[PDB]
Amino acid sequence: NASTVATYSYTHSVTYVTDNILKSLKDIILLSGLDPEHFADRWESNTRAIKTWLGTGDLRKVILEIYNPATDKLVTRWDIDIVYGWSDGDGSFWTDTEQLKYAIKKAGLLPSQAKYKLMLDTKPGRPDVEGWSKGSYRSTDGMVKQSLGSTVEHSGLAGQAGYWRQR
Numbered sequence: 001n002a003s004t005v006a007t008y009s010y011t012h013s014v015t016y017v018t019d020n021i022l023k024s025l026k027d028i029i030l031l032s033g034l035d036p037e038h039f040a041d042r043w044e045s046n047t048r049a050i051k052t053w054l055g056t057g058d059l060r061k062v063i064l065e066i067y068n069p070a071t072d073k074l075v076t077r078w079d080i081d082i083v084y085g086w087s088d089g090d091g092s093f094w095t096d097t098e099q100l101k102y103a104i105k106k107a108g109l110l111p112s113q114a115k116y117k118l119m120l121d122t123k124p125g126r127p128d129v130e131g132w133s134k135g136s137y138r139s140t141d142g143m144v145k146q147s148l149g150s151t152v153e154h155s156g157l158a159g160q161a162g163y164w165r166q167r
Helices: 010-031 037-041 043-056 098-107
Strands: 059-068 073-084 093-095 115-122 143-154 157-166
Touching (some): 010 037, 010 043, 010 059, 010 093, 010 157, 037 043, 037 115, 098 143, 098 157
Antiparallel strands (some): 059 073, 059 115, 143 157
């Protein structure tokens, strides 16, 4: 019953990064005061699509739009860009989301019926994933983007986070 330092496969690094990207978005929703039920019901569906396109390397961005349904316009948006720096499974792994909390406060109060929508930005030749079809981004005009640094990494596979707020 000995444990020793593990060498991890790429699929393991993908699984780790996928689970922690969704956890950070779950924390953004919790800290924003939004209903977590919608994101929770989609947890495995979102997981499958993110792992699929991280496995092929086609996934460019994970995007959470927070919008107002009365106006259909963005209130805030949260971006996580993928960095494909995976050379081997012997690299370090970590999560860091402490700065997301302060960005949510910077973004300010949200309207009473605010909702969220998850979007995945991919290369065009991406394999099809059941249930996932072409979407369109809500307009970011009149908003400002600020990068927040890397929120997750596992052995070179990393996610760089940023967000959009109204000026």
